[PDB]
Design a protein around this ligand. Structure first.
Ligand SMILES: COC(=O)c1ccc(O)c(O)c1
Ligand SMILES: COC(=O)c1ccc(O)c(O)c1
Ligand SMILES: Nc1nc2ccccc2[nH]1
Lengths: 188, 185
């Protein structure tokens, strides 16, 4: 990920005017939609947390967790740490990123800071559900001037996205003020 | 550098008991000694600064600055960012590292933060002098418990090095309390 770290703007867009900041969310959402589309229930939830982190979760299959034969780490870690621009760009430019994967009856958890995993992906428990959750805190060493998420920017885009992605339920929650929206277009 | 950032302990040594912390200095010192050995005056100066950083300077020829033909960045940057363990390890585990190279009539400078160059190596002025200087601020995200340099730990090692590298003068200065030593065999 050092190539992204060296020139963040070339990968995410403008890091000073808020456009790159919001691009972080939309990159994660694109992955979540892809996950949601492969399942039959298809729901994603985007939450703006009070600490100005954002989490995106889907109830899909859960991204793969098995050890990659060549890389020697979990598939999820490979996706997060090897160079849409890819979620690895978001990970690189996040001061913290939490990953939770529910798959095959197991809960997998991992934490990253500035793209660096704090430990290997670990099975911490059991679950009856499936899905992936990523919560990230944009790096304040990279994102300057505009550092807080604008609800309207997210809601507008998620609304547009719902019409292209039929059957996918999209929820947006702002924990700073309690605002909620639900974008679900059932065409097709 | 992510392999280093991922398992700092495996590259530099224990990051909680002060071992790894001091090894950071010794890695830089190895490079400085090599550089000093190739020069005429043969002196390195190791300084513990009051803000808990350490600088190591030599009066050697200056490490190479030209663009690496294959990597496409300065040779110094290649050495600082591509995997003794190598100074790239120190760079990766330093929240800030400042590099100054005096060579071929010019002064060159570069800043890194957590091993990431903030800009390319750049010519900032002219000079008659030659040598290299690295000042590094160990990352406190990595180094825990023992975060302050112990003078005697540095002095002990530097003394051993002065006997082995007998033509080289080694100066140790502590700007916190003014203690200093001069190892020369
Ligand atoms: C590559 O997959 C991801 O990074 C990813 C997938 C699904 C999600 O719900 C999410 O928040 C992130
Ligand atoms: C690659 O060389 C170095 O990293 C290096 C060389 C000489 C020095 O005086 C120093 O502090 C560092
Ligand atoms: N604070 C901070 N910034 C970083 C950039 C790259 C790797 C680790 C880092 N820790």
């Amino acid at each position: 990920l050092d190539a992204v770290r060296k020139r963040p703007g070339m990968y995410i867009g403008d890091t000073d005017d808020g456009t790159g900041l919001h691009h972080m969310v939309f990159e994660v959402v694109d992955n979540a939609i892809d996950e949601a589309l492969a399942g039959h229930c298809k729901e994603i939830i985007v939450t703006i947390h009070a600490d100005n982190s954002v989490s995106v979760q889907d109830d899909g299959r859960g991204i793969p967790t098995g050890i990659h034969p060549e890389e020697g780490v979990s598939a999820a870690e490979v996706i997060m740490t090897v160079l849409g621009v890819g979620v690895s760009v978001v990970n690189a430019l996040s001061q913290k990123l939490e990953l939770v994967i529910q798959r095959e009856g197991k809960i997998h958890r991992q934490i990253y800071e500035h793209g660096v995993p704090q430990a290997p992906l670990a099975v911490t428990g059991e679950t009856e559900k499936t899905g992936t959750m990523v919560r990230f805190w944009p790096s304040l060493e990279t994102f300057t001037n505009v550092t807080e998420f604008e609800y309207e920017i997210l809601a507008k885009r998620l609304r547009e996205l719902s019409f292209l992605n039929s059957g996918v339920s999209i929820r947006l929650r702002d924990k700073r003020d309690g605002k909620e929206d639900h974008f679900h277009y059932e065409g097709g």
